[PDB]
Amino acid sequence: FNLDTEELTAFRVDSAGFGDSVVQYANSWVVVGAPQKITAADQTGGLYQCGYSTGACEPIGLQVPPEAVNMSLGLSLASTTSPSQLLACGPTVHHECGRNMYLTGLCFLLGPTQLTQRLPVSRQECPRQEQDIVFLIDGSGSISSRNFATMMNFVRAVISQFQRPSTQFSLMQFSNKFQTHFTFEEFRRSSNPLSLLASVHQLQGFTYTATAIQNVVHRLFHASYGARRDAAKILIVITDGKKEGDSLDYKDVIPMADAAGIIRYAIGVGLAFQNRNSWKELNDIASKPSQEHIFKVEDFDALKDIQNQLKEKIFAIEGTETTSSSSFELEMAQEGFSAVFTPDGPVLGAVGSFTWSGGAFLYPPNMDPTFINMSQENVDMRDSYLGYSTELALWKGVQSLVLGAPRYQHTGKAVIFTQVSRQWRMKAEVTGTQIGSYFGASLCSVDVDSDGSTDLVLIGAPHYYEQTRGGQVSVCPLPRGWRRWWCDAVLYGEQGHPWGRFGAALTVLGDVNGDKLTDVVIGAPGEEENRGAVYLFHGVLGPSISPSHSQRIAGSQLSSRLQYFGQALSGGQDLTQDGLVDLAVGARGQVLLLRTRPVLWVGVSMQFIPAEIPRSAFECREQVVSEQTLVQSNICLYIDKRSKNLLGSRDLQSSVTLDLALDPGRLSPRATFQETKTRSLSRVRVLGLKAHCENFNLLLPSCVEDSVTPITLRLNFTLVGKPLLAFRNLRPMLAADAQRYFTASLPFEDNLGISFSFPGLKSLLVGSNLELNAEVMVWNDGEDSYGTTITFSHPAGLSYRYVALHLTCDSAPVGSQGTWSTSCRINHLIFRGGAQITFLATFDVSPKAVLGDRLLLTANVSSESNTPRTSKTTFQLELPVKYAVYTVVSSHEQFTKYLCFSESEEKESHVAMHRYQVNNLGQRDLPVSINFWVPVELNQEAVWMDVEVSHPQNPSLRCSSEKIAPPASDFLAHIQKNPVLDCSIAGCLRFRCDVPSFSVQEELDFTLKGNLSFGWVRQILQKKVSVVSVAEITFDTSVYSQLPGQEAFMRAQTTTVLEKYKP
Amino acid sequence: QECTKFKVSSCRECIESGPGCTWCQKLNFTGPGDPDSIRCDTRPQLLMRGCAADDIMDPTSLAETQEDQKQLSPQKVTLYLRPGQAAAFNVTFRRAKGYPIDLYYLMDLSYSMLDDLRNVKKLGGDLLRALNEITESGRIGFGSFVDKTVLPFVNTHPDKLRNPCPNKEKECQPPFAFRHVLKLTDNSNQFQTEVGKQLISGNLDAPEGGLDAMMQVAACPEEIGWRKVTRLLVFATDDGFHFAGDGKLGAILTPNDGRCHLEDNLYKRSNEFDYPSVGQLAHKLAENNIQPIFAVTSRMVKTYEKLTEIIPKSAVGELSEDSSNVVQLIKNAYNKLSSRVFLDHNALPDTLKVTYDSFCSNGVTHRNQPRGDCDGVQINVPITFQVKVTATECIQEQSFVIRALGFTDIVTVQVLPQCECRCRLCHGKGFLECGICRCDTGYIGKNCECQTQGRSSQELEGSCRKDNNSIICSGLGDCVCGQCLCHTSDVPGKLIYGQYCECDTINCERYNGQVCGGPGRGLCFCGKCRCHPGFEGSACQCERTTEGCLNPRRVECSGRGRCRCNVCECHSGYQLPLCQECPGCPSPCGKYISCAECLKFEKGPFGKNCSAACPGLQLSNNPVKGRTCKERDSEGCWVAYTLEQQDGMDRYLIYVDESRECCGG
Ligand SMILES: *[C@@H]1O[C@H](CO)[C@@H](O[C@@H]2O[C@H](CO)[C@@H](O[C@@H]3O[C@H](CO[C@H]4O[C@H](CO)[C@@H](O)[C@H](O[C@H]5O[C@H](CO)[C@@H](O)[C@H](O)[C@@H]5O)[C@@H]4O)[C@@H](O)[C@H](O[C@H]4O[C@H](CO)[C@@H](O)[C@H](O)[C@@H]4O)[C@@H]3O)[C@H](O)[C@H]2NC(C)=O)[C@H](O)[C@H]1NC(C)=O
Ligand SMILES: *[C@@H]1O[C@H](CO)[C@@H](O[C@@H]2O[C@H](CO)[C@@H](O)[C@H](O)[C@H]2NC(C)=O)[C@H](O)[C@H]1NC(C)=O
Ligand SMILES: *[C@@H]1O[C@H](CO)[C@@H](O[C@@H]2O[C@H](CO)[C@@H](O)[C@H](O)[C@H]2NC(C)=O)[C@H](O)[C@H]1NC(C)=O
Ligand SMILES: *[C@@H]1O[C@H](CO)[C@@H](O[C@@H]2O[C@H](CO)[C@@H](O)[C@H](O)[C@H]2NC(C)=O)[C@H](O)[C@H]1NC(C)=O
Ligand SMILES: *[C@@H]1O[C@H](CO)[C@@H](O[C@@H]2O[C@H](CO)[C@@H](O)[C@H](O)[C@H]2NC(C)=O)[C@H](O)[C@H]1NC(C)=O
Ligand SMILES: *[C@@H]1O[C@H](CO)[C@@H](O[C@@H]2O[C@H](CO)[C@@H](O)[C@H](O)[C@H]2NC(C)=O)[C@H](O)[C@H]1NC(C)=O
Ligand SMILES: [Ca+2]
Ligand SMILES: [Ca+2]
Ligand SMILES: [Ca+2]
Ligand SMILES: [Ca+2]
Ligand SMILES: [Ca+2]
Ligand SMILES: [Cl-]
Ligand SMILES: [Mg+2]
Ligand SMILES: [Mg+2]
C-alpha cells in the first residue's frame, strides 16, 4: 500500500525491446536489457544502466566477439551483492557449423571491483574432422641449410594452422637413415607442440624417398603410434625431387599407400620443379588430382586453404531416430537463457540441452563447470524446457537449485536439485495441473522471517486459464525434512483479465509494512488489454503469502502509452537513497522505478474533565437555560514511525484533518462545542513525531431527557504526510489497516469484584491446546453500577474469540509491548447490588505462542462511575506452561534378524547390526538426546564385541560410551520365563548421542554394529535366545512434553535371535 | 419456512428481510400495545395469529415464457425474481438432423508426418463422401502447418531452409508456420489436385506450431471461407504442440493478438508473434463456433485429451499409423461431439446465480449443476434442461443469454425484480399503504401521532425497555411515541436494529481477519452469519463442499480420514493433505505373520479361515512397492514378505517369498 504512484521515475530508451529485462544492481543502478536492439552488424541486444539521480539511461559499454551473432543480449539479467556483481546474457547466438546452425548463448560477468569476463569461458566449437597428419621431410645432403631451414618453418607454419585435438601431427626425417622426431602419441601428450621442433637437426646422407614413405605407412599410421582410427590420414612429403640410392621405386610403395586411403601432398624444395625428372618425382608422390596436391616449400597458405575441415553431423529432427542419425546434446543448449547467483558461483540455465530436456551449468571460478539436469533415464523430460527459469534456495548451510520446466508433459513442473556427495541430485519435484498453464515459468525464493534460510518458493503459471481470469502463482514451501514437495496455497490477481498473465514476473521487495515479514511483488503484463499491472502481497506468519493483495498498480493508473507493465520485476534494494526498498518494473519501451513510502502509526488518548458529570448540571426551576455547564476534553495524538530504517527521518512533518461528533446517530445531541455552534468540529494541524495534545470546550445544557447513557465523542482523521523536500517530495502515510474511528464516553452520575478460574486444566500445553476457557464470575455487593466493563490482560499468544448473557467485546494491544488486552463492556443491563453474573470467556492460544514457563491472566473490573480504583478486586491467576512436540524413534526395516550357528561354532562369532531412525513430526525445533542400550556381556563373558554406533548420514553428531552393571538376578529363571537377553540381566553398554538442535521433519539415522558371539549361549540352557537392544529419546521434560497420547513411541527396541542347529 | 427480522418498517422491507417472510395488510391488525414488527412473519405464524389468507402479502418468483423453433425453445424468457427465492423455467433441446457442415482439414506437414501424407492425398473423395452422408451441403477445405521459422524450432541455415528433410529426398518443401491450401469448397476434385501439389516439409524440434495455425483458421473466416453453418476443424499430427511462452527461446515476447495475419495464404508475421495460449485459442474457437477434432497418434491421445477440458466442444480420435482411419475417426468424433450437449449462460453479474437440471433421453439425470450437461443425445429425441435463477439483491434491468455450445441459437432471458406488493385516515401526515401508515418526513407513529423532535412524553417508555433491568432502547436508540428509533453509526456495514435495538450486524464470529468473511461468503445478522448461496458454516469459515479431500480418483482422504470443511480428519499419525501416509505409526510387519503364512503356504494357525482372518490382505504373486518384513512362522522358520498399503483402513497388498529361511531341520 506504500508504493508511491504519483511521484514516479520514468526511463525511456527507444531501443528495440527496451525494458524486457530489468534488474537492481549494486544499490545504485537499474540495469535494463534491450534484446532486440541492433547494436552492430549481425549483432543484437543492448544494455542500459539507469539512475535515480541522472533520471536517464546510458549504454553499458561491452565489446562483443564477432562469432556471437544476434545473441539477443539482455534477454535475461541477474545480479547479486557483497560483492556486487552483474550477469547479463543473450541465449540466441547463431553459430554456423557445416550446413547446420547451432543455437548457444553467451553471458558477461560484471563488477566494479573486478574485470569483465565472459561465460561460458570458451567459445562453442564446431565438431571438426579427425585427421592424422605425418610430415616426411628430406634431410639428405642435397638439401642444404636454408632449404632445410625453410622446410622446418613450413612445418611450423602448418602446425600452427590446425586446431587440437582435431588434428595431431607426426614428423619423420629421412635420408638413408630414418628418425621419427615425434610420434602422434608424443605430439598429443606434448605440453607444447612447438617445443619438439627445436631439437630437429639435418641428417645429411643419401636420399631414400620410397622406402621412407613405406616406413611411414607401415609404422607412423598405427594405433600403437597413437594414430586414430576414424582420422583422415594425410602424408606431407617434403623433398627436392632427387632420389638416390634407394632400392625401391615409387610404383612399389605408392599403391600400398593408396590402399590405406592415405592422402599425399608433395611439397617441392629447390630445383624440384624445374628439373623434368625431379618434377615427375613430385607428381608420382602426390595424390590425384596432382595440381591440387603439389605446392612449393615457400607456400605456407597452400596446405590450409583446402582444409579447415569439419565433421558433418546429421540431427534426429522431430524426436525421430534414424539409424545413422545422432541425438541433440549441447548444440541447441542456449546456455544463459536464465541466470542466478549462487555462493559456489553463477548458474546459467540451458533450455535446449539434450533434445530440450533442459538443465543448468554451475560455473565455479577457475574450475570445470558442472552440468545440472535430470538423469539420462528420464525421457519424459524431453521438450520440458528445464532451466527456463533458475532460482537459488537455502536451508541453513545447504544451497539448493530450483529449475523451471514449463513444458513438462504440456503441463509444466519445477525441480529442486541439491549436491549429494560431490554430485548434484534431484531432491524434489512439484507438477502443475492445467495443460498449457506454463507452471514453472517464473521462480522466486522467499525468506519470510529473514533467518537466512529459504522458506517459500513462489512458482509462476502465467498462462493458467479460467473463464474470468488468467495467470496463477503457487505458494510452495520448501520440502524440508523428507516430506514430498507440494503447493500450500495459490495466489490470483483481480478478475476480468482472462489472459492477464498473472505471475509472469516475481520479485522480493522485502518487508515494507514493518511486520518483520517479507513482502513480495507479482506482475501481470496482460491485464486490461496488455497494459499491465503489478500486485503487492504481504508476508504471513508460519511462512505463507497473504491470499489477497495489499496494493494493485495498473499500467493505465500510472500512464497512457504504457504496455506490458509488469513483464519484468526487481526489488529489495534501495536506489532512491532514502534507505527504503524500491521496485524496478519492466514495460514495453519503458522502465519505471517505484519507491516505497515511509509508514506512520497514529494513536489516540481521549479523556474528559471532570471524570463523571456532576448532577448539579440537571437541577432547575426549569430555566430554559442551556450550555451553562462547560466540559473540557483532552485529546492527544502521538505518532510513531513504523519504518525504523529511513534516511533523513529526523523531522517528519505530517498534516492531519480532525473531525469530531457529539453523540452521533442520536436525534438530539446532549453536547455542543463552544466554538462551532453545533456538535460538529474540525481541526487542521501540522504534526511531527512524539506527541501533540489539545483541549476542547464542551457545553452541556442544564436539563436533558437522557441521563442514563454516557455522552460520546467520536473522532476520525485523514493524514497527509508533508513532502520532505529532501528525497524529492517523498511523503509518509498512515497504515492502510489503521483504525480511523475513536470513541470516548463521558459518564453521568459502587464497589465491584472480579473472580475467575480455569475449568479442566492445571497446566497449559502449547500446540496441544488451541483454546483457553476461563470461567469468569463478577459480583456487585454494594451500590448499583452502570456500564460494567470487564477488562482482560494477557500475552500476545492469546486473543478473545467470540462464541455463540450478551457481551460486546473489542481487542487491542496495550502495555510497554508484548501484552494485549480485551475489555468487554456490558449493558442492556443495570447491574444491581447482590446480583452476580458468571460467564465463559474463551481465549485462542497460538500454537507458536511464546508464553515462557508462566502464563499470567489478569482481570480488571470497572464501571462508568470511576471509583478511585486501586481497590483490589483485580484478579490474576498463573498457569504453568509447557510446549508440545512429536518425536519418534523406530526400529529400521533392514537389520540382523537372526544368526544360525552349529554346535561346534562356539569359538566363533558373526557380524550383527541394529538400526534406528528418529523423526521430528512435531511443529517445533528441540534439543534431544538419544540413548542406546546394548548388551555386551553376560556373567563377565563376551556377548557382543566391539559395538560401535555409526551415523554416515548426518555425520556431525557426537556419541559416548558408558559401561553398566546389571541388577544381579537369577538369570536362568529370568531366561526361563522368556529367552531374552537385555540390560535387566546382562552387562550393558550405554550410548548417548546429543542433538543440539533437532529440526522439524528432520530424520536421524543410527547404526549399532558389532560382532555377536556364540559361546555365551551355553550359559542359558536354551536352544535359541533373543538379543535385545533399546533406543530411547530424552528431551528437557520441564520445557517440553511429548504429544499427548503418543508417549509410548519415545522408546524402541530391536531383536536378533541366536539359533543353533545340529549337523 | 424461516423468517428472521431485519428491516421491519415497511412491506417491501419485510420481503427484503428474508425469502420466507410475509406481510399482513389487515388494518389495525396490531393490538394497542403491539409493535408493527409483528406484521412481518412466516405465513404459518401469521395464520396462527389470525391473519387472513386473502390479505397476506407474499410476492413469489415467477417465470413467464412468450413462445415465439424446436431446437432451442423458448427463445424468449422473462423472469420476475424475489431475493432468495429461485425461479425456474424449462429449456427444450431437440437435435436437428440435417444442418450443413464445413470441414477444414488442418494437416501436419512436419517430416515426422512423411508416411501420413500419401494417404491424405487420396482423402478428398472419401472425406466429402462421408461428409455428405452425414448432412447436406457438405464442404471440405485444407491447410498445412509446420512451425515458426526461427531457431531452435527450425534450422535457419540457408541450405537446410531450402531442404529441411534429413535424408536427401527430392520431394521436399521449405519450412513454414502456416499455409492455406484450399478455401472451403464442395468440389472434391479440386481438393485432390490442390492438396496433391503440397509437399512434405521438416523442422528441428518435436512439438510443432499447430496452435499458431488453428488460431489463424479461427481468425480468418473470410479467407478460409466458413459458412455460418456447423464448423469442423480436423487437427492431424503425431506429436505435441508449442503454446504461449515457448516463443521466448526465439526471443519472441509479443503475445498472439488473436487476429488475422495472412499474406498470400501464408502466416508471414509468424515470427513477430508468440504461440497462442490454449486459453486464448479456446476462447477464439468457441467464439467462432469452430469445433476442433484432434486426430492424433496413439502416443499423443492422452495429452490432447486434456484440451477437451478447456475446450468444451472438441473431441480426440486416435489416428492410425499412416492416417488410414482418418475418415472413420472424423465421423466417430462428430458423433461424440453431437451426442453431448452443453447448456450454458454468458457472463453473469454478482447478484444472479444460475444452476441447471439436466434431463436426458439417455436415462441419466443431473440436478443443480452449474452447466447443463447431457450426453448420448439422439436426433429428434428431445431433452429438457431446468434453469434455476436466484437473485441475492433486488436487481435492476438485465438481460443474459443461454445458448447450447456448438450452435448459434440463443435463449434470451429477461430479468425483472420482484420486491413490490400489489396491496388491495392516519391522523394527518401519513398516507396509508398495504395495511399500515407510512408517515411524512420528520413524523413517526402508528397513526403518525408523534414528531421526531418535539414533546415525546412519559409512560409510553414502558414498552421501550426489554425488561425491568434493561436500558431504554438498549441505549442504542431513542424512544419516540412508545417505540424505539435506533441510532445511525457511520461505520460501514454497521446497522443497529431490533424492537429494543438489541441487535447489530457487526458482532459475529470471524474468518480471516474480517466478520463472516467480510462482504464475501456471508453476511452477519445479530450473531448469526447468514451465508450467500453456495457457502455455509458458523462464521462461514469453511468453504463450500467436498472437493479438497479427494485423491485424483475421488476416494476422499484415502480411507483413513473423513472430511469436514475440506480439512481431512484422519486418525493416528496420518498427516495432511490427503491423509495418505503415517510417519509415526509402528511397522505393521509383526501382526500379519499368521496371515502371510496361511495365504502362501496353506499352513499356520489360520489354516482354512485364512480368508476370514485376513479381510484386508490381498495376495500378490509378484513383488510389490511396500515395506520390507520378515518374521518367524508357526514352526519357527523365517518368512519374508512385503506390505504395500492401499486406500482404506488396514488394507494392504501383500507379497510373500516362496523360499523360507530355516536353520536346517
Ligand atoms: C542430462 O545430462 C546428461 C549429461 O550430463 C545426459 O547424459 C548424457 O547423454 C549423452 C547423449 O545422450 C551421452 O553421450 C553419449 O555417450 C556415449 C558413451 O558414453 C560414455 O562416455 C560418456 C562421456 O564420457 C560417459 O558419460 C558414459 O558414462 C557411462 O557410465 C554412466 C555411469 O552412470 C552410465 O550412466 C552411462 O549410461 C554410461 O554407460 C560412457 O562412459 C557415446 O557412445 C555417444 O556417442 C554416440 O552417439 C553419438 C550421437 O550423440 C554419435 O554421434 C556417436 O557416433 C556415438 O554413436 C554419446 O556421446 C552421455 O554419455 C550421457 N552422460 C551420462 C552421464 O549419462 C542426459 O541425457 C541428460 N538428461 C536427459 C533427460 O537427457
Ligand atoms: C542476424 O539478424 C539480422 C537481423 O535480425 C539478420 O539480417 C537479415 O538477414 C536476412 C537474411 O535472409 C535478410 O533477408 C534481412 O534483410 C537482414 N536484415 C537486416 C536488417 O540486415 C542476419 O541474417 C542474422 N544473422 C544470422 C547469422 O542469421
Ligand atoms: C470522518 O468520518 C466521516 C463519516 O464517518 C467522513 O464523512 C464522509 O467523508 C467521505 C469522504 O471520504 C464523503 O464521501 C462522505 O460523504 C462523508 N459522509 C458524511 C456523512 O459526512 C469524514 O470525511 C471523515 N473525516 C475525515 C477527516 O476523514
Ligand atoms: C567378526 O565377525 C566376522 C563374521 O562376519 C568374522 O569373520 C570371519 O573371520 C575369520 C577369521 O579367521 C574367517 O576365517 C571367516 O571366514 C570370517 N567370516 C566370514 C563370513 O567371512 C570375524 O572373525 C569376527 N571378528 C572377530 C574378532 O571374531
Ligand atoms: C420441467 O421439466 C421437468 C421434467 O420434464 C419437470 O420435472 C418433473 O415434473 C413433473 C411434473 O410436471 C414431475 O411429475 C416429475 O417428477 C418431475 N421430475 C422429477 C425428476 O422429479 C419440471 O417440473 C418442469 N418444470 C416446469 C417449470 O415446467
Ligand atoms: C481361525 O480359525 C482358527 C482355528 O482353525 C482359530 O484358532 C483359535 O485361535 C485362538 C486364539 O484366538 C486359540 O486360543 C485357539 O486354540 C485356536 N483354535 C484352534 C482350533 O486352533 C482362530 O482364532 C481363527 N481366527 C479368526 C480371526 O477367526
Ligand atoms: Ca526463513
Ligand atoms: Ca512485511
Ligand atoms: Ca529507497
Ligand atoms: Ca508420424
Ligand atoms: Ca517443431
Ligand atoms: Cl642426396
Ligand atoms: Mg638428396
Ligand atoms: Mg512432427
Tell me the C-alpha distance between A304 and A301, whole Å. 6
B563 contacts B569 by C-beta, under 8 angstroms: yes
Of all protein residues, whose CA lies closest to atom 61 belonging to ligand 1?
A: A376
φ and ψ at A150, to 5 degrees? Answer: -70, -45
Beta-sheet strand order (sheet of A771-780): A752-757, A771-780, A836-845, A798-801
Question: Which residues in B lie closer than 8 A to residue A94 (C-beta atoms)?
Answer: 151, 156
User: What domain range includes position A643?
Assistant: 598-749
Nine cell digits for residue B428: 394527518
d(CA B552, CA A132): 62
The residue ranges of DSSP E strands in B13-108, in sequence order, are 22-24, 40-41, 56-57, 62-65, 72-73, 76-81, 87-93, 101-108
- B152, B166, B471: residue with CB nearest A828: B471
Nearest by CB: A465 against B253, B279, B627: B279
Each residue of B626-660: b (16+ CB within 10 Å) or e?
A: beebbbbbbeeebbbbbbebebeeeebbbbbeeeb
Contact A604, A738 (CB under 8 A): no
The span from the CA of B362 to the CA of B339, in Å, is: 10
Displacement of CA A791 from its chain's centroid (Å): 46
Angle at A732 between CA A727 and CA A736, to 5 degrees: 145
Whose alpha carbon is nearest atom 18 of ligand 3?
A: B490
By what technique were these coordinates determined? X-ray
Residue A875 lies in a domain: yes
CA distance A222 to A218: 8
> B115-122 — which CB contacts under 8 Å span 24+ positions?
B115/B321, B115/B322, B116/B236, B116/B238, B116/B319, B116/B322, B116/B323, B117/B198, B117/B200, B118/B322, B119/B322, B119/B323, B119/B324, B119/B326, B120/B195, B120/B236, B120/B323, B120/B326, B121/B192, B121/B195, B121/B196, B122/B192
Could you tell me which residues come within 8 angstroms of residue A610 by beta carbon, excluding any fewer than 6 positions away?
A631
Q: Which of A749, A782, A810 is the last residue of a domain?
A: A749
Nearest CA in chain B to A890: B586
CATH class of B68-95+342-422: mainly beta
Entry field: residues in chain A: 1063
Q: Does residue A299 have a known ligand-binding role?
A: no
CATH of the domain at A985: 2.60.40.1530
* Residue A155 backbone phi and psi in degrees, to 5: -60, -50
Are the C-beta atoms of A416 and A402 separated by less than 8 Å? yes
Among all chains, which residue has been given the C-alpha cell 529449475? A403
Q: Are residues A405 and A536 in the same domain?
A: yes
Which of A94, A463, A894 has its CB closest to that of B151? A94
Q: Is A340 in contact with A332 (CB distance < 8 Å)?
A: no
> Residue B635 and residue A108: Cα distance in Å, rounded?
74
Residue of B490, B487, B494 whose CA lies nearest to B515: B494
Pairing, β A599-609 against β A590-595: unpaired
Are residues A714 and A621 located together in one domain of the fold? yes
Measured between CB atoms, does A153 come within 8 Å of chain B? Answer: no
Query: Alpha-carbon Rg of chain A, whole angstroms?
Result: 43
Give the Cβ contact number of residue B611 at 10 Å. 11
| Residue A580 CA to ligand 9 centre (angstroms) | 4
B255 lines ligand 6 (CB under 6 A): no
Alpha-carbon dihedral sign for residues B438, B439, B445, B448: negative
Contacts of B486 in chain A (CB under 8 A): 665
Whether residue A83 has a cis bond before it, omega within 30° of 0 = yes
From A99, A567, A893, residue closest to B157, measured CB to CB: A99
Domain end position, chosen among A831, A850, A885 = A885
∠ CA(B631), CA(B633), CA(B637), 5° rounding?
Answer: 85
Q: What is the C-alpha end-to-end distance of chain A, expressed in Å?
A: 86
Q: Pairing mode, if any, of strands B627-632 and A875-885? A: unpaired
Question: Residue B224: which of B197, B248, B260 has the closest Cα?
Answer: B260
Residues A669 and A757 in one domain: no
**Separation of CA B448 from chain center:** 53
Any domain includes A318: no
C-alpha A476/C-alpha A469 separation (Å) is 21
**B96-341: CATH number:** 3.40.50.410
- Same structural domain, A356 and A247: no
Local structure of A290: helix, strand or coil: helix
Written as nine digits, the cell of B469 is 433491568
Contacts of B250 in chain A (CB under 8 A): 92
Distance CA A229, CA A220 (A): 13
Comparing CA positions, the residue from B640, B645, B646, B644 lying closest to residue B659 is: B640
| Length of chain B as a residue count | 665
CATH number at residue A719: 2.60.40.1460
Cα A268-A273-A277 angle, rounded to 5 deg: 110
Among residues A494, A579, A580, A567, which one has the least CA distance to residue A537? A494
Ligand approaching nearest to the C-alpha of A70: 2
CATH code where residue A63 lies = 2.130.10.130
Q: What is the domain count for chain A?
A: 5
Give the residue, by CA position, lying nearest to ligand 1 atom 51.
A326
What dihedral do alpha carbons A493, A495, A498, A504 form, nearest 10°?
-10
- Residue of A281, A239, A224 lying closest to A140 (CA atoms): A239
Do A435 and B157 make contact, defined as CB atoms within 8 angstroms? no
The residues that bridge with A608 in the sheet, in sequence order, are A633
Q: In degrees, to the nearest 5, what angle opens at C-alpha A979 toward C-alphas A973 and A984?
A: 70
Q: How far apart are CA A149 and CA B384, in angstroms?
A: 103
Asked if A670 and A725 sit in the same domain, the reply is yes
Best substitution site from A361, A376, A417 to test ligand 1's pocket, by max atoms within 8 Å of Cβ?
A376
Chain A environment of B586 (Cβ under 8 Å): 890, 1049
For chain B, what are the domain ranges? 1-67+423-453, 68-95+342-422, 96-341, 454-483, 484-665
| B467 annotated as ligand-binding | no
How many whole angstroms from B612 Cα to the centroid of ligand 6?
Answer: 11
Residue A323 lies in a domain: no
**Are A353 and A467 part of one and the same domain?**
yes
Data resolution in angstroms: 2.9
Domain boundary among A705, A732, A749: A749
CA distance A890 to B588: 12
Domain for residue A525, yes or no? yes
Residues, CB-to-ion distance under 5 Å, ligand 14: A 318; B 110, 112, 239
A:B CB pairs within 8 Å? 225
Q: What is the dihedral of CA B352, B357, B360, B363, to 10 degrees?
A: 160
Tell me, yes or no, whether A325 lies in a domain.
no
Which amino acid makes up residue A882?
A: K
Element (H, E) at B211: helix B210-219
Beta partners for A673? Answer: A698
How many H-runs (helices) and E-runs (strands) does chain B carry? 13, 36
Report chain breaks in chain A, C–N > 2.5 Å, as residues after which they occur.
Answer: 749, 804
Q: Rounded to the nearest 10 degrees, how much is the dihedral formed by the CA atoms of A975, A977, A982, A986?
A: -40
Nearest chain A Cα distance for residue B248, angstroms = 9
Q: Which residues pair with A756 in a beta bridge?
A: A776
CA distance linking residue A662 with residue B501, whole number of Å: 20
Q: Is A20 annotated as a binding-site member?
A: no
Residue A798 and residue A661 in one domain: no
**Among the listed residues A872, A791, A863, A869, the one whose alpha carbon sits nearest the alpha carbon of residue A829:** A863
Torsion sign over Cα A556, A561, A567, A568? negative
Task: Tell whether A103 lies on the interface with B, counting CB pairs under 8 A.
Answer: yes
Ligand 4 centroid from CA A908, angstroms = 8
The SS3 of residue A14 is coil
Distance in Å, alpha carbon of A648 to nearest chain B alpha carbon = 35
CB A298 near ligand 2, within 6 Å:
no
Question: Is A906 within 8 Å of A995 (Cβ atoms)?
Answer: no
Residue B573 in grid coordinates: 499419525
**DSSP H helices in A353-462:** 353-356
**Closest by Cα among A278, A282, A281, A306 to A292:** A306
**Torsion from C-alpha of A175, A178, A181, A187, nearest 10 degrees:** 120
Separation of CA A37 from chain center: 32
Mutate to test the interface with B, among A73, A77, A318, A475 (most CBs of B within 10 A): A318
Nearest by Cα to A141 from A178, A176, A181: A176
Q: B552 among the known binding-site residues?
A: no
Cβ of B202 within 8 Å of Cβ of A318? The answer is yes
Cβ count near A808 (within 10 Å)? 14
Nearest of B486, B447, B416, B537 to residue B6 by alpha carbon: B486
Nearest Cβ partner of A486 from B491, B527, B577? B577
